[PDB]
């Protein structure tokens, strides 16, 4: 029942976009030999074990996802994302393409806007992964649209967070060199200067299966 | 700012309004009573609605129901809405009897009745129930136990409980005498003395006791034991 407005814009969608504009910052940057993703994990205390609460989940052996909104919604969209990675894998024996997968999740998010008595999704996705047509890094909007980004951020204060990427990014960057330009876009962007194994980073890892980098592995890059 | 309209709306304070009004609805209806004894569980039900009809039969308006021979159920509130819960109570016993060939125990029936009352609270279209239910029994080996089901679940085991229009009055009268080890034949005469305190000499209080070593099954009021009421002491 999220109807229109006289100005010609959905008001519930604009309200939903404010929720992703005030959550933890998610950041993905593509490269020429893989795609990387990062998320500022706001650790509230030492009681929450890091191996339970995560911001980087998998869809298949080559698809990575990132969350940027309502934590309670970080699982329902994941269940239908993995289900679509299975329904395509049952009929078609090969792997699910990212463009074929992102167009289905965008259709699922869309149906939660036109249906009566429902609420739009309070999150922004970041689907990334190795494909047979190169690499990809898409971003799903609560409105239902999707963009074929190259390097983007969706969390809190992204108007100036993207400014680091508009001036410190080249078309031909390796995945190992893109890690430090991503950490700089997190530590040197805003508060959270005590970045000591409090950042989750997933990579495509040059056509190998999706690898979730461990805390001590990121520590090698956290020294700079 | 008017947030107690539907049942699915939560108040900003944190309380759940539109369900707390039901307690003010059962506080204006007639009362019911029950208590533990060393020989059984004597029940009670006062129907303080004498000033308007005066044409009903003497022993017609009965508010004591039983799902089978050993579990009694009373009402406190809207008498119409309580019929639907008894239908769900007897059907719960019959469904449990088909699947398990035995009488349904007390600690598994109360948990299934409270779920039925609570299930109508969650809906945005169905109105919640308006009847507090007293469920009790008396085992042969173990002693009795009285479960009180009010609106919005909350099944609680008691030892004596009164609900109705004088719940803050009769509660002080039960804590005086330790009813846990007395009898049933003497408590029935003590119960009739309480009603006279708080309003006439009428036989509008129909009640039965589940056990008097009378095969430990739900009996009737047994008028001959009710007529020698100590109307003065």
């Amino acid at each position: 029942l999220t109807t229109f407005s006289p100005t010609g814009k959905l008001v519930q969608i604009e309200y939903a976009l404010n929720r992703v504009s005030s959550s933890s910052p998610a950041l993905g940057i593509r490269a020429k030999n893989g795609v990387i993703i990062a998320t500022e994990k706001k650790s509230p205390n030492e009681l929450i074990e890091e191996n339970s609460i995560f911001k980087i989940q998998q869809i298949s052996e080559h698809i990575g996802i990132v969350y940027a909104g309502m934590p309670g919604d970080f699982r329902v969209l994941l269940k239908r994302a993995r289900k679509e990675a299975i329904r395509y894998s049952l009929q078609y024996g090969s792997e699910i393409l990212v463009k074929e997968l992102v167009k289905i999740i965008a259709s699922i998010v869309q149906e939660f806007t036109q249906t009566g008595g429902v609420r739009p999704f309070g999150l922004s996705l970041l689907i990334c992964g190795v494909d047979v047509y190169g690499y990809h890094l898409y971003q799903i909007d609560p409105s239902g649209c999707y963009f074929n980004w190259m390097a983007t951020c969706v969390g809190k204060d992204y108007q100036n967070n993207m400014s680091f990427l508009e001036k410190r990014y080249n078309k031909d960057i390796e995945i190992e060199d893109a890690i430090h330009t991503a950490i700089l876009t997190l530590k040197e962007s805003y508060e959270g200067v005590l970045n000591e194994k409090n950042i989750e980073i997933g990579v495509a890892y040059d056509n190998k299966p999706f690898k979730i980098l461990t805390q001590n592995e990121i520590k090698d890059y956290l020294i700079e | 700012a008017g947030y107690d309209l539907s049942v699915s709306t939560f108040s900003p304070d944190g309380r759940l309004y539109q369900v707390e009004y039901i307690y003010k609805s059962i506080n204006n209806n007639n009362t019911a009573l029950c208590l533990e004894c060393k020989d059984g569980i004597i029940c009670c039900c006062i129907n303080s609605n004498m000033d308007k009809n005066k044409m009903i039969k003497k022993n017609s308006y009965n508010r004591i129901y039983h799902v089978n021979n050993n579990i009694i159920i009373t009402y406190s509130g809207f008498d119409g809405d309580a019929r639907n819960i008894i239908d769900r109570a007897r059907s719960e016993a019959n469904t449990y009897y088909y699947n398990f060939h035995t009488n349904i125990p007390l600690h598994i029936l109360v948990n299934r009745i409270s779920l039925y009352i609570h299930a109508y609270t969650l809906y945005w279209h169905m109105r919640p129930f308006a009847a507090s239910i007293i469920i009790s029994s008396f085992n042969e080996k173990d002693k009795g136990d009285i479960y009180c089901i009010e609106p919005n679940g909350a099944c609680y085991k008691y030892s004596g409980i009164v609900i109705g229009k004088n719940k803050e009055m009769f509660k002080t009268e039960i804590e005086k005498k330790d009813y846990k080890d007395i009898n049933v034949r003497d408590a029935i005469e003590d119960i009739y003395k309480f009603i006279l305190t708080s309003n006439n000499l009428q036989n509008l209080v129909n009640f039965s006791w589940i056990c008097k070593e009378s095969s430990y099954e739900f009996q009737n009021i047994h008028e001959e034991i009710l007529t020698p009421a100590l109307n003065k002491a």
Binding site: Q12, Y15, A16, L17, N18, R19, S21, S22, N45, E46, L47, I48, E49, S52, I53, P71, G72, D73, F74, R75, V76, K79, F112, G117, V118, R119, P120, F121, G122 | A1, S8, T9, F10, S11, P12, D13, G14, R15, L16, N111, S114, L115, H118, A119, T121, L122, Y123, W124, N152, G153, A154, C155, Y156, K157, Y158, S159, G160, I161, K171, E175
Partner: protein, 246 residues
């Protein structure tokens, strides 16, 4: 004024679901607390045994409900919503056996509960379930697991956590109580976790509730290895552990 918090599926201008936010305040208003803490090869839940704000049998009122013989859990908040949540968990954990053979995992149980909770959030079908709880239980990996879930979707999981009305005055105490065993002595594991974790658990509850903590008003449960049963610790052992504070 008539703000935007009427329905449950309607966002606010700033972007906050106020029907969920008010539901969390329902748990903080029941003034019933509980502490859960996982140590080495064990985990315990400490109840409070208080009526959700005479002749009430205190052995019946509780805040501990076993979902299965291996996975136990606690419940707080409104008594009506917490009872139905156990039935929506017992009928789910037992359904896992009939649909997958193995016993349900502790981490999978909480995530499957939150999936049904999230469905009632996006749809205006029913009212939110004003409750919370600490799902406890060991897994096949012979490791203890603890998980807490809010009225919204959450599968946080903590090595020591407090649920109830005093979550804003306990993290500063549980961190010290956990530090009183981690970076301290930490000699070995003589399978005496009960004398090591539960003693360092009941002490945490006494630092939260300023009362004397009567043994007849508190009941705990252990799911440690060699036991695996979510057994409610008897009254005599509770009163015995209360004297260990001296």
């Amino acid at each position: 004024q008539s703000m935007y918090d009427r329905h449950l599926t309607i966002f606010s201008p700033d972007g906050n679901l106020y029907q969920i936010e008010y539901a969390i305040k329902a748990v903080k208003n029941t003034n019933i607390t509980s502490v859960g803490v996982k140590g080495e090869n064990c985990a315990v839940i400490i109840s409070q045994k208080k009526m959700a704000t005479k002749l009430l049998d205190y052995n019946n009122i509780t805040n501990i409900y076993n979902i299965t013989d291996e996975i136990g859990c606690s419940m707080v908040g409104m008594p009506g919503d917490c009872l139905s949540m156990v039935y929506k968990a017992r009928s789910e954990a037992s359904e896992f056996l009939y649909s997958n053979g193995y016993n349900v995992n502790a981490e999978t149980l909480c995530r499957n509960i939150c999936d049904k909770i999230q469905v009632y959030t996006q749809h205006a079908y029913m009212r939110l379930h004003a409750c919370s709880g600490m799902i406890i239980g060991i897994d096949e990996n012979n490791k203890p697991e603890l998980f807490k879930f809010d009225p919204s979707g959450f599968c946080a999981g903590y090595r020591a956590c407090v649920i109830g009305n005093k979550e804003q005055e306990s993290i500063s105490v549980l961190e010290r109580l956990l530090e009183k065993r981690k970076k301290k002595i930490q000699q070995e594991t003589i399978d005496e976790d009960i004398r090591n974790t539960t003693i360092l658990a009941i002490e945490a509850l006494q630092t939260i509730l300023a009362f004397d903590l009567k043994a007849s008003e508190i009941e705990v449960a252990i799911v440690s290895t060699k036991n695996r049963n979510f057994t409610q610790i008897s009254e005599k052992e509770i009163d015995n552990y209360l004297t260990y504070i001296a």
